[PDB]
Design brief:
part of a larger assembly, 4 chains, 328 residues, alpha/beta, Rossmann fold, nine-stranded mixed β-sheet, 15 helices, globular, binds magnesium ion, metal-binding (chains A, B, C, D), NAD(P)-bd_dom_sf (chains A, B, C, D)
Chain lengths: 328, 328, 328, 328
Amino acid sequence: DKTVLDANLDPLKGKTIGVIGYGNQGRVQATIMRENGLNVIVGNVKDKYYELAKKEGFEVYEIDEAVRRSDVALLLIPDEVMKEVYEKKIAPVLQGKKEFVLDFASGYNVAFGLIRPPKSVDTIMVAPRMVGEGIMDLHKQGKGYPVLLGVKQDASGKAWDYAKAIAKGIGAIPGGIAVISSFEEEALLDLMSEHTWVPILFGAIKACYDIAVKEYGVSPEAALLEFYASGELAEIARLIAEEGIFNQMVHHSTTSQYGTLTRMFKYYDVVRRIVENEAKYIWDGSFAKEWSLEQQAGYPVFYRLWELATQSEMAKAEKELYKLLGRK
Amino acid sequence: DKTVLDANLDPLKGKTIGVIGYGNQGRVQATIMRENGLNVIVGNVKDKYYELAKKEGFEVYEIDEAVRRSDVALLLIPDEVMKEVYEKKIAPVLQGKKEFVLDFASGYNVAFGLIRPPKSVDTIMVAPRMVGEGIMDLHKQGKGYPVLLGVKQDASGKAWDYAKAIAKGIGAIPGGIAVISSFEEEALLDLMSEHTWVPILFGAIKACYDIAVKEYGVSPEAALLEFYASGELAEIARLIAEEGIFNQMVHHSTTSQYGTLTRMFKYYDVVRRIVENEAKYIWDGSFAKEWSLEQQAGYPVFYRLWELATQSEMAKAEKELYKLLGRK
Amino acid sequence: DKTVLDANLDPLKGKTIGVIGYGNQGRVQATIMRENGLNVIVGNVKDKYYELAKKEGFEVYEIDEAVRRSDVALLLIPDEVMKEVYEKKIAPVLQGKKEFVLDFASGYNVAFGLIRPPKSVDTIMVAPRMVGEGIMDLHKQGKGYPVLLGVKQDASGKAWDYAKAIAKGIGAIPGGIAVISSFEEEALLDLMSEHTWVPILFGAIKACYDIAVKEYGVSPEAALLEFYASGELAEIARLIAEEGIFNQMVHHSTTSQYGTLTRMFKYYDVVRRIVENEAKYIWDGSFAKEWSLEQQAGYPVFYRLWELATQSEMAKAEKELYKLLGRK
Amino acid sequence: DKTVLDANLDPLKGKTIGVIGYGNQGRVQATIMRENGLNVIVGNVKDKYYELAKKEGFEVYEIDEAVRRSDVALLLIPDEVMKEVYEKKIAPVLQGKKEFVLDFASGYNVAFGLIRPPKSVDTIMVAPRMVGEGIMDLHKQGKGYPVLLGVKQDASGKAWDYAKAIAKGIGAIPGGIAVISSFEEEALLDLMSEHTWVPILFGAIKACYDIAVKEYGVSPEAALLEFYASGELAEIARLIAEEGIFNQMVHHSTTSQYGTLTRMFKYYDVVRRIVENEAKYIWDGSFAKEWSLEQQAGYPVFYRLWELATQSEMAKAEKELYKLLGRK
Ligand SMILES: [Mg+2]
Ligand SMILES: [Mg+2]
Ligand SMILES: [Mg+2]
Ligand SMILES: [Mg+2]
Ligand SMILES: [Mg+2]
Ligand SMILES: [Mg+2]
Ligand SMILES: [Mg+2]
Ligand SMILES: [Mg+2]
C-alpha cells in the first residue's frame, strides 16, 4: 500500500541536527532522537525553555547560529510566529548554504506560500497525530505512533529517505506507521476538523440547553448533567478509538441505536453541504487571508466572541455547578 | 435552590425491599444499599444473573413472589421488555396490595402511558447519570453521584421522602447531588441527546471522510487518523468534563479557537431548528409510537441500516487499519 | 462473466429433499427434479394440494416431519404466510439439526430480517423469472430457463455448489442460464417493477381515457378500443421479448417512431426522479414496515382502493363493452 | 434608580492629574476642574495646542513625563491615533507604576480589545453627551450636563468613587446627571446612530430630490427649498429636545400629523430589520475590523465615496443656490 512500517537510518548518521524550539514537540523529538544516537543541538531564545533545555543536557546556541552549525533543522514552533523568525534569522543564513534539509510538523505556512524556501533546499514534513504527552506515554513502552509524510521540494533525490529516517529517529516507527501525503492534505485535514464537527457539536449542545430551558421548563442543573457535565462523552470516545465507531453502539440500548441511526441518515446531506463549503473555502486560500488580516487588525472579533461565549447563560450555570461538585 | 445534598433514611428502616433485575444497575444499587443496612431481596428469572446474585449472598425468589414479600420495589430492567413483565406478573399481585411504592430508573414507559399503575401506589423515579461501572469506581472512595427525582402519583404524602431516602440508600448522596424533576423531563433529555448531537456528529465525520477522499484525492488511512482514529476526541471530552467546555479551548492554538468560535456562531440557527423539530416530535408521543410499531413489524429498518453502516467504505477502511495498528 | 450455463450434480445425490408447498412452483420443481433422479418428498397441510400431490405419486408427510427426514428443503410458499410457518413448525426442528440447507425462491423475508435462521445452516436462493406455466411449456422441449442465485450464510464452503446443483435439478440449465446475485437485489428488482412502470402505465391509460371523454367529447366505446381493449399491447410486448425493445419499432410508421422517441427523451428525468424515490424507500426497509402494519390493521386501504378502482367510470364502460364483444 | 445626581470629591484631593490632549474636550475639562481646585497638568506634543495651553496658564510637559508625575490620567484624543500613543509612550511608563487610574471618554478601543491595560490599573470611562462648545455655554450658568459611567477593571474597590469624583470635577453634576453603564453600551450607542438613522435620513432626502426632478418635472431650486435648504428641520429638532418628540407635532397641521403617524407605523418593521442587522454587526466586532483594515489599505473607499457624493447633481445644485442666497 502507500504505507510504511520501518526504514533505514543511513542519512542522518554523521550529520548534525538542530531543533528549533523546546516546547512540547521539540522537547520530545529531541530527547528521543538523542536516545537513538544522534548528535543534537537546540536553538531557542533565552527564556524558561532555554534554561530547561540546557538543564536536560542539551548544548544550546542561538537560532541563527544553530542553523550555521547544522545540516538538518526542525522548525518546531507555532504557526503564528514562524514567518518573522524565518524571514529575519533563518533565510539569510540559508542563502549562505549549499545542501540543507528543512523539516516541518505543519504544512500551513508552506501550503499557502507564506514561506517560500529556495531551490537549493529539500523541504519536507513529518506530522504526528498525538497530543505529545501521550507520545512519551508510548515511547517508554517501545511503541510507535502514526505520522504523515510530505515533500514539497526535492533537490537531492533523497528527500523521502530523509523523511523516513526522521520518522524512525523520533520513534514513531517501528511500532506505529507512516503515511505519505502532501503539505496540502495535512493542512486541509487539520483545519476541516476545527471548522466542521467540533463547532457543530458545540452549537448543538448549546441549542439543546437553550431549548430545554426556555421551552419545556427544565432546570439548568439537569440539562448540564445530561448533555456534557457527565463523563458520558469520554467513554463513547474511548470505545470509538478502541472498538470502532459503529461497533461502539452495541454496548447501548436498542432504543438509542434506532434513534441514532435514523436521525444520522436523516441529516447527512445537510452537514455534507456545510463540509463542502468549508473545505472549498480552505482549498482556495481564503481562510489564511481572513486569519492573517485579523491578526493585523488586532483580534477584535476573537475578543468579542470569547466574551460572548463566557458571558452566556450556559457558562454561568456551569460555573455555579462545577463549584458545587467541587470540580475546580 | 431546587437541589438536595443529603436527607433522612427514616422510611426504609423496618421495610423489605425488592430489586427486580440483577444487571449492572440492579447489582450495584442492591449491593450498596445492603452495605447501608437494609433488608434486601432479588426477583429474577432463572438464568446467569440468578446464579450470580444468589452467589453474592442474596436470597433470590421469583418476581411475583418478590413483590408479595416486599413493601418497596425497584424495576431495574430494560425499557423494551418491562411492559409484558408488568402486565403479567406484577399488576395482579399489585391489585392485591394496600400501600406500595414503585420506583423506576427511566420515565419512558410511564411518561407515555405504556404503564399505568393504580392510585393505591406511590409512583416515583430515581435516575442516575453514570454508566454504572464508574459508580462503583466512586463508591469505594466514599463519593456520591448525581441523580434525578420525580413523582407521578402520591397516595401517601410521603413520596418525596421515600425518593430522598432511596437516593441516600444507593449512595448517591452525600457526595453527589439530587435534582427534582418529572418523568417527562428525564425521558425528553435521555432522548434529545440520542437524536440531536450524537447522530449529527457521526454524520459530519462521515461526510468529512467522503469529501476528502472523493474530491481532494486524500488517502483513507490519513482521513481516519485525523478525524477519529486518534484519541484526540477523548482528551477534549475529559477537559470538558473537568475544566469546562469553553475554558477547555485555552489549551489549543489561537487559529483553532478562532475557526471554532466563528463557525459555531455561524451555524447555530441551523441546528437549533433541528433540535426544535425533534424535541417537539418527542413531547407529543410520536417517537414512542414509531418505535413500538417497528418492534411489532420485526425490526426491518433497524436491520437494513445496521447493514448499510457496516458495509460503508469508511467502515471497511477502519477495519483494515485497526488490524494494522493491532487494535482488536 | 458472472454467468453460468451448466454445472455438476454431485452434492444432491444420496441426500433426501423436501418440498414445502405444492402450488404452481413446488409442483413444477418437484416433478422435474424427480424426473432427474432424486429422492423427493412433500410437506403440506391436508387440503386440495395434499390429495393432488399424493395422487401424482409423491409420499406426503406433515411439514415438521418432512424437515426431520430431509437434509435439504425448499420453502415454496407465499411470502405473506411463511413467517408463522417458519416460527412454529420449522425453527424448532431446525435447532435440532446438524448440517442443513434451506432454499428460497424469494428474498423478501430474509433480506429484511423477518426470518433469521441460525448459523449452522446454509441459506441460499434460486429465483426463476417465469410464470411457472410456461416453465413446463419449456421443459417438455428439453429447454432451460433463467434464474438468479444468492447466498446469505455459508457454513460449509459448499453453498454455491448446492445452488448450482439445484438450478440443474429443476431443469433451468443447461438450456437457460443462472446469474449470481444477492437476496437484496432480487427483492429490489421484484418490487421496483410493481412500484414504478406498471402503476405509471395504468395511471397514464386511465388519464388518457378521462381526458378524451371529458374534454374532447369522445365516446367511451372508442377510447377503450384505442387504449387497451385491442390486442395491440400484447403484440408490442412479444416483439420486445423477441426482436428487442428498440428494433421493435421498425415495424411501425415513421410518425409513430418520431413521436415516441421525442416524447421519451423529453420525459426521462421526471420518471427517473420517481424511480429514485421508490428504490430508496425500498432499500431502507420502509415498504416492508408499511405492508406488515397494513396486514396487522385489517387491510382497510387495500379494500377501499379495490372498491374505488372497480367503481370507476372506465371499469363500468369496459364491463358493458366486454359483454358486447362476447369476451367473458 | 441607576441614576446619580451629586457625589463626593474625596479621592482626587491631594493627587496630581494629567490631561492628555488639549483639543476641545481636554481644554474644557481641564479648565473646569482647575476652577474646582485641583492640581492639573497637560501632556501634549509641541504644536499649536501646546502654545495655547501653556498660554492659558497650564504647566505643559511631554506625554510620557506627564504620566510619570501623575496618579490619574485622562486620555482625551481621537480614537484613531490613541493606539500608537498608548503602545509607545504610555504602556512602558505604566508597567513601571504601582496604583494608577486611567480614564477614557470613548469605549471603542477598549470594548474591542485594541487597548488592554494591565491589572494593576483601574480602567474607567466618563463620556459626555454634548458637543463641547455648549458645555462651556452651560458651565458659565452653574448648570451641569449628562454623562455615562463605566468600569472595566477594578483593582482598588474604589473605581466608581473615582468616576463620580471625576464627573463632579468637570462640572457635569450637580446640575445634570450621571448614568452608569459599560464601555460596550457607549460604543454600541455612539455607532448605532452613525449607522442607522443619519444615513437613512440622508438617503431618503436624496431620493426625494432625484424622484421629484426626474419623474415629475420639478425644478431643483424648489426641491432643495422644501427638503433641507430651509431651516425647517432645525426647528423640529429644537421642539423635540424641548417639548418631546411626539408632543412636538401638536404645533403642526392635522394633515401632517395624520400622514406622519400612518406612514410611521407602516414602515416600522422595515427599519427595525436594518437596525437589528447593524447592531449585530457591531456587537460582534466586525465593523472595527473593517475600519482598521481600511486604514491599513489607504482609505480608497472613503476617497471614492467622498468624490461621488460631492460630484452628485444635488450637491452642484445646492452650490449654485447657496451662492445665490448669499450663504457662504
Ligand atoms: Mg486535528
Ligand atoms: Mg491544529
Ligand atoms: Mg443520555
Ligand atoms: Mg438511554
Ligand atoms: Mg416481477
Ligand atoms: Mg412478486
Ligand atoms: Mg452620537
Ligand atoms: Mg462619535
